Amino acid sequence: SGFRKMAFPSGKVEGCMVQVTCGTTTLNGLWLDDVVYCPRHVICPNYEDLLIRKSNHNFLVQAGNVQLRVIGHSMQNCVLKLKVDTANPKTPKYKFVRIQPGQTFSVLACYNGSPSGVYQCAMRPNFTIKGSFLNGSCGSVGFNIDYDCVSFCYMHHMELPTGVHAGTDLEGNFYGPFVDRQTAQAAGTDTTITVNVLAWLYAAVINGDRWFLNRFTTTLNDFNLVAMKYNYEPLTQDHVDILGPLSAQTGIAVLDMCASLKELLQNGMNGRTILGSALLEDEFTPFDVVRQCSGVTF
Amino acid sequence: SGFRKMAFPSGKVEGCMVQVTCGTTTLNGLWLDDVVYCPRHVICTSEDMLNPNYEDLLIRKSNHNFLVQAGNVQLRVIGHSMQNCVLKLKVDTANPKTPKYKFVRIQPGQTFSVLACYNGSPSGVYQCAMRPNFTIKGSFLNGSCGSVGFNIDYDCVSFCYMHHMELPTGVHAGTDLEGNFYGPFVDRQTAQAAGTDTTITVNVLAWLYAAVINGDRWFLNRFTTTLNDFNLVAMKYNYEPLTQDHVDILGPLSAQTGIAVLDMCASLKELLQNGMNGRTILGSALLEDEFTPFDVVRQCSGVTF
Ligand SMILES: CC1(CS(=O)(=O)N2Cc3ccc(Cl)cc3[C@H](C(=O)Nc3cncc4ccccc34)C2)CS(=O)(=O)C1
Ligand SMILES: CC1(CS(=O)(=O)N2Cc3ccc(Cl)cc3[C@H](C(=O)Nc3cncc4ccccc34)C2)CS(=O)(=O)C1
Ligand SMILES: [Cl-]
């Protein structure tokens, strides 16, 4: 029993965190094999003009108490790739993956190449993440683990005026319409991840919370007409198919649970909670619910 | 900016998790130097759990009855002893991944990270608090016994909890690493229930100061209160009494934000009376009590917004 916001064990990622310094800027880098990956703004804009003026010895890379020697450098989109002399002996099995909004991941927040905390979060529909970062956190990474392979999906770059965060995949492509520079940019209006709220309602049923269930069902079209009015993402047939296993386990059809979500949206909770929460939670995917309500290990 | 429920990086603890098997029971163990620590109920059958005599069950065992597995390697058990509700298995190999560590016993209201494991393999990490009734609201399934709670201060891992059992309400009970249970609980399947739970007042206050540091002041008022009048009101909402020690501990956050502890106490009294009125505090519609004053200073900036 119990339902917590759970992150993946961070050990395989901790062994990759390094400190990168260029002049007066200090941020975090990801050391995989003989390459250190970090935000290109560490050189700060015309990034190719700023980069051509730098030499290998201008980049100071520190792994623990050891200084790594930079022997080459190149840029790929908004990420800087620093070739080093030493391959990381702690390099795990890994892949670089680009996630979609609504997907969740673990974040290992670092300052000065040292990991300080781990938390779970989701890529919002507006492509921002509601993270917890201070100055020096740039270059901190987001990841998922599938068996023994770490899938790197996010690298932190900046904070927006509303306190939310923006970053790139590990190939340096931004999530969202953002740019790496000091300019007027704001997060778009955000929406609730409908397939995630539904998965979290199934997790509540699994843990013995059934007060919100009703005898009613709905059509997918009628549900979406209601959901659009509460700034909820449209629910697709793919989402319905993905919720199939949880529907079969609890005996509650996906459209049956949608009628419960419609009633919660029009009437509220009435002084009640679901899994210790007075809000409808949208940062657990259907896979996160199945993984936590089973013993999947790494 | 931002305020998340943050756990400590789990790497130093992952390198200590092992699988312990005794007959038909399989659970987790903590391998530190040449000793593996695990719940003593690994020697029990499900029947035994009603009224087990652990001393009588242990005397009948030999070193080779305990199978210890670290990754794909089998560790050899060369000795065994019992210390309260924990079994200590002496092994023939010291853990090369042993971090700098200490065994600490925490008090209710304190927080810690939990590395949940099944079959000696870590599956997830989460943050939680020791409740006033000495239980923890964890996320554990069968096979999680022996999973540990910890804090990492500087490069040292302070082990404070080892998981032993799930009570009938879904809450969890366990021991410190010296095998002493937190709460009036026993490693017996007897009729035992968690005491009435209460809100950790000093933690809710710390969390209100974290919201002021992040720029939110909608809940503040022009009133103050006496400590006694605050406690008479707080008791009525099942909130823990606030002591002078708690007031002293909140001093740094009070000095940083410019809001006296008893003025923050007045704002809490008002929140309990009125509710939130469709508003949230740090993305939450409930008053949060699983962040200590130390957690807030650690996570939040030193500059108020
Ligand atoms: C104070 C702000 C950030 S900044 O001006 O300090 N900043 C400019 C800048 C521009 C482009 C790029 Cl790619 C990166 C950056 C940097 C940046 O965002 N860093 C930070 C990342 N994460 C958390 C941060 C918490 C506090 C301060 C900096 C944080 C530094 C936040 S705001 O109100 O939108 C402006
Ligand atoms: C299913 C229950 C636990 S048990 O009867 O399987 N159990 C008895 C017992 C007694 C004392 C001691 Cl020290 C240990 C144990 C064991 C125990 O609690 N195991 C477990 C630990 N943590 C999470 C668990 C989630 C599900 C199942 C087992 C879990 C085995 C929970 S309940 O509904 O109140 C009965
Ligand atoms: Cl303590």
Same domain, A186 and A200: no
Residue position matching structure tokens 């992040």: B214
**Is B140 close to A298, i.e. CB distance below 8 A?**
no
Going by alpha carbons, the residue nearest to atom 29 of ligand 1 is A135
Can you name the residues that pair with A174 across neighbouring β-strands?
A168
Q: How many CA atoms lie within 13 A of A224 on its CB side?
A: 10
Query: What residues contact residue B20 under an 8 Å CB cut-off, 6+ apart?
Result: B26, B27, B28, B29, B36, B38, B42, B66, B67, B68, B69, B89, B120, B146
Resolution in A: 1.8
**CB B87, CB B175: distance < 8 Å:** no
Same domain, A131 and A143: yes
Same domain, A62 and A181: no
CATH number, domain containing residue A287: 1.10.1840.10
Query: What residues contact residue B232 under an 8 Å CB cut-off, 6+ apart?
Result: none
Report helix angle B261-274 to B227-235, nearest 10.
30
CATH number, domain containing residue A31: 2.40.10.10
Same domain, A78 and A106: no
Tell me, using a 6 A CB cutoff, whether residue A159 lines ligand 1. yes
A204: chain B residues, CB-CB within 8 Å = none
Which atom of ligand 1 sits closest to the CA of residue A138? 21
Distance CA A192, CA A102 (A): 9
Same domain, A245 and A118: no
Final residue belonging to a domain, choices A190, A206, A239:
A190
**CB B5, CB A119: distance < 8 Å:** yes
Give the other-Cβ count within 10 Å of B76's Cβ: 12
Distance CA B11, CA B155 (A): 12
Same domain, B135 and B212: no
Same domain, B138 and B280: no
How far is the centre of ligand 3, averaged over its atoms, from the C-alpha of B110 (Å)?
5
Q: CA triplet B295, B297, B298: central angle to 5 degrees? A: 60
Classify the C-alpha dihedral A100-A103-A108-A110 as positive or negative: positive
Q: Which domain holds residue B261?
A: 198-301
How far is the centre of ligand 1, averaged over its atoms, from the C-alpha of A158 (Å)?
5
Q: Which of B1, B8, B295, B301 to mutate to test the interface with A (most CBs of A within 10 A)?
A: B1
**Is A133 close to B166, i.e. CB distance below 8 A?**
no
A109: chain B residues, CB-CB within 8 Å = 6
Facing B118 at nearest CB: one of A131, A132, A297? A297
Q: Name the minimum distance, in Å, from the CA of A294 to any CA of chain B.
A: 8
Using CB distances shorter than 6 Å, the residues near ligand 2 are A 1; B 41, 49, 140-142, 144-145, 164-168, 172, 187, 189
Which atom of ligand 1 sits closest to the CA of residue A41? 13
State CA B231 to chain mean position distance: 26
Closest Cα in chain B to A4: B139
Same domain, B6 and B61: no
Same domain, B5 and B151: yes
Same domain, A203 and A109: no
Closest Cα in chain B to A110: B9
Closest Cα in chain A to B144: A295
Tokens of B39: 């719940």
Classify the C-alpha dihedral B167-B169-B172-B174 as positive or negative: negative
Final residue belonging to a domain, choices A92, A107, A126:
A92
- Technique of determination: X-ray
A279: chain B residues, CB-CB within 8 Å = 280, 284-285
Which of A159, A157, A160, A177 is CA-nearest to residue A168? A157
How far is the centre of ligand 1, averaged over its atoms, from the C-alpha of A175 (Å)?
16
Question: DSSP letter at B68?
Answer: E
Tokens of B18: 């092992």
Which of A127, A73, A85, A123 is CA-nearest to residue A103? A123
Question: Three-state SS string across chain A, please?
Answer: CCCCCCECCCHHHHCCEEEEEECCEEEEEEEECCEEEEEHHHHCCCHHHHHHCCCHHHEEEEECCEEECEEEEEEECCEEEEEECCCCCCCCCEEECCCCCCCEEEEEEEECCEEEEEEEEECCCCCCECCCCCCCCCCCEEEEEECCEEEEEEEEEEECCCCCEEEECCCCCECCCCCCCCCCCCCCCCCECHHHHHHHHHHHHHCCCCCCCCCCCCCHHHHHHHHHHHCECCCCHHHHHHCHHHHHHHCCCHHHHHHHHHHHHHHCCCCCCECCECCCCCCCCHHHHHHHCCCCCC
Can you name the residues that pair with B117 across neighbouring β-strands?
B122
Residues A102-135 as b or e (16 or more Cβ within 10 Å = b): bbbbbbbbbbebebbbbbbbbbbbbbbbbbbbbe
Same domain, A8 and A124: yes
Residue position matching structure tokens 């993402």: A233
Distance CA B13, CA A244 (A): 36
Distance CA A60, CA A42 (A): 11
Final residue belonging to a domain, choices A145, A170, A190:
A190
Tokens of A171: 């190939």
Q: Name the minimum distance, in Å, from the CA of A64 to any CA of chain B.
A: 12
Q: How many domains does chain A have?
A: 3
Tokens of B48: 């035994």
**CB B177, CB B103: distance < 8 Å:** yes
Same domain, A84 and A183: no
Facing A7 at nearest CB: one of B7, B14, B128? B7
Q: What are phi and psi of B68, to 5 degrees?
A: -115, 125
**Is A117 close to B7, i.e. CB distance below 8 A?**
yes
Q: What SS3 class is residue B152?
A: strand
**CB A97, CB A152: distance < 8 Å:** yes
Catalytic residue positions of A, numbered: 41, 138
